[PDB]
Structure 1
Amino acid sequence: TVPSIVLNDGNSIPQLGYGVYKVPPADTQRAVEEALEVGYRHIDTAAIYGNEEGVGAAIAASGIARDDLFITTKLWNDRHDGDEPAAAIAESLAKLALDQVDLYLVHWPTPAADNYVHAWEKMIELRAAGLTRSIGVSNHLVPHLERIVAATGVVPAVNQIELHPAYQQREITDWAAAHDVKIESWGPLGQGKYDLFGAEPVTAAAAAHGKTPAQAVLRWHLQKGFVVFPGSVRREHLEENLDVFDFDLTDTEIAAIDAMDPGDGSGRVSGHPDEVD
């Protein structure tokens, strides 16, 4: 059993899902079929991942009822302009072989291109047309968010950003809570870019519950109310990552993990929105 959370638009989303980022396209179908089998229902993909087909194929292969699944895809940086958003989403839909997706995201803000507002406008139209159930963004900074909302009056259901113990983007998460936008933690486990599992706050919490560090970290995101979809191809980790609704961390435990953030942005492991396209 994976609990769901409710969006500002009333739609619900499973709090834990399976992200297929990094999964080679030729292997995505197996990977998803396995997650599916494991009990995963929320699939996180993206057009840029070039593996929507595999996901779609996996879905179809599973006997699974459409309504029981949560499918997320994202709008690539080069499709912000004109009616490209509608073209991009249609392509995605065709790959997934779905009528519509559950959630659709503006992959990156590409501020320098100053087309993220236009993208947002088009996104709204996509939802209106029923191409997607909900809409959100990704990698959007506070100013990005203010601007889109100001321009449209429509608030993203979510903001998918890089988030883990060493790099929390508190300003964003704070803004989100104030605006009722849910947070999707990408790279929830640091992408192996640093010794997260070695962190003492992490080991203390895991040990304190008879869980793994990965599990404890996952629990922290969850408890903080964020949405997670860690990547993994090992069934051992799949099952493991699913086994986190069984327990809960103490406030003290959470607080200790929260202290891991240097507060200077030095804990970042991936690309910054001001730098991507």
Structure 2
Amino acid sequence: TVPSIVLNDGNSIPQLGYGVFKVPPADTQRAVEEALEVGYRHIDTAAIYGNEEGVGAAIAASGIARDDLFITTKLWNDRHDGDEPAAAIAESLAKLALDQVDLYLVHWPTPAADNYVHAWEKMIELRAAGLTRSIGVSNHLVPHLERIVAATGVVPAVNQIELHPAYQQREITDWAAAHDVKIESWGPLGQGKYDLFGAEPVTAAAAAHGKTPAQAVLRWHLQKGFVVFPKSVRRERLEENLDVFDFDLTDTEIAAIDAMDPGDGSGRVSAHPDEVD
């Protein structure tokens, strides 16, 4: 039924949602219509995904009240400077055809450009302007975090990062936990970049509960306190991935999955912030 988690700002976010990364813009409307139909209420898009349009149409097409929906969009890398943030969100808003998004994020820190503090400053402006209910960042390291916070005194609501069994970024989640910041896992199912489902601590928890391996992972994230939003273009999967409030892995089972993280950062499948310009 998807539980909702309380953010540091007093806003609630549905623990499981649907991501649109890699869904072609042209198929984006159907893709989202289905997800809404199936039962999903939290959509994760990005200006860079080029599909805010489909997302908006779908939402419009569906009969759901805005209140029951949670839209999240993101601020692209080339828009951190000056008042580009205000221009950026406004265009997203027009694409999505909404009055306001639920959450807005700084897509990447782009540390070489040294403009993330500035972008965060502006972010705080958009929230006060009512353009977005909450603000958070994505792909920010602990140093990035400490700085933006020390600089503004405004803690981000979330931090969306690459997170899965083989690469957990514990230093970040740990920090996030002490700072009342919620973690959003991206690429929660390894983005299909490695045999996650064949993983034995994975296969073991699956058969033990009669769930699929994909479902075992999600439940892992979920029990860890993470917000997840897997992507799939297949109805079956939307349904499968949505049915995970059933079981409950065991402490030991959770331990077994956790141990999949080598600790040398070798399980990473995507880009490291220090490489994204």
CA distance in 1, matches of 2:260, 2:148: 32
Residue 188 of structure 1, CA deviation? 0.1
Calculate the TM-score normalised by the size of structure 1.
1.00
SS at match of 2:35: helix
Unpaired stretches in structure 2, ≥5 consecutive residues: none
CA distance in 1, matches of 2:63, 2:82: 38
CA distance in 2, matches of 1:37, 1:185: 24
CA distance in 2, matches of 1:129, 1:141: 27
What percentage of residue pairs aligned between the two structures are identical? 99
Calculate the TM-score normalised by the size of structure 2.
1.00
CA distance in 2, matches of 1:110, 1:40: 32
SS at match of 1:208: helix
Residue 37 of structure 1, CA deviation? 0.1
SS at match of 1:161: strand
SS at match of 2:130: coil
Task: Report Cα offsets for 1:52-109 as digits up to 9, x if no partner.
Answer: 0000000000010000000000000000000000000000000000000000000000
Task: Report Cα offsets for 1:149-188 as digits up to 9, x if no partner.
Answer: 0000000000000000000000000000010100000000
Root-mean-square deviation (CA, aligned residues, Å) is 0.4
CA distance in 2, matches of 1:207, 1:105: 37
Residue 3 of structure 1, CA deviation? 1.0
Residue 42 of structure 1, CA deviation? 0.2
CA distance in 2, matches of 1:137, 1:26: 28
CA distance in 1, matches of 2:10, 2:251: 28
- Misfit runs of 4+, over 6 Å: none
Residue 2 of structure 1, CA deviation? 1.2
CA distance in 2, matches of 1:25, 1:264: 37
Residue 8 of structure 1, CA deviation? 0.7
Task: State the match for 2:244 in structure 1.
Answer: 244
CA distance in 2, matches of 1:260, 1:21: 25
CA distance in 2, matches of 1:100, 1:247: 35
SS at match of 2:183: strand
CA distance in 2, matches of 1:209, 1:8: 34
Residue 132 of structure 1, CA deviation? 0.3
Residue 211 of structure 1, CA deviation? 0.1
Task: Report Cα offsets for 1:9-40 as digits up to 9, x if no partner.
Answer: 11000000000000000000000000000010
SS at match of 2:133: strand
SS at match of 1:105: strand
Task: Report Cα offsets for 1:205-233 as digits up to 9, x if no partner.
Answer: 11111100000000000000000000100
SS at match of 2:149: helix
Residue 247 of structure 1, CA deviation? 1.1
CA distance in 1, matches of 2:131, 2:205: 42
SS at match of 1:21: coil
Q: How many pairs align?
A: 277
CA distance in 1, matches of 2:249, 2:7: 24
CA distance in 2, matches of 1:180, 1:2: 21
SS at match of 2:31: helix
CA distance in 2, matches of 1:112, 1:51: 28
Residue 202 of structure 1, CA deviation? 0.5
CA distance in 1, matches of 2:20, 2:92: 15
CA distance in 1, matches of 2:133, 2:246: 30
Residue 246 of structure 1, CA deviation? 1.0
Residue 264 of structure 1, CA deviation? 0.3
SS at match of 1:274: helix
SS at match of 2:27: helix
Task: State the match for 1:92 in structure 2.
Answer: 92
Unpaired stretches in structure 1, ≥5 consecutive residues: none
Matches within 5 A, 1:101-120: 101-120=101-120
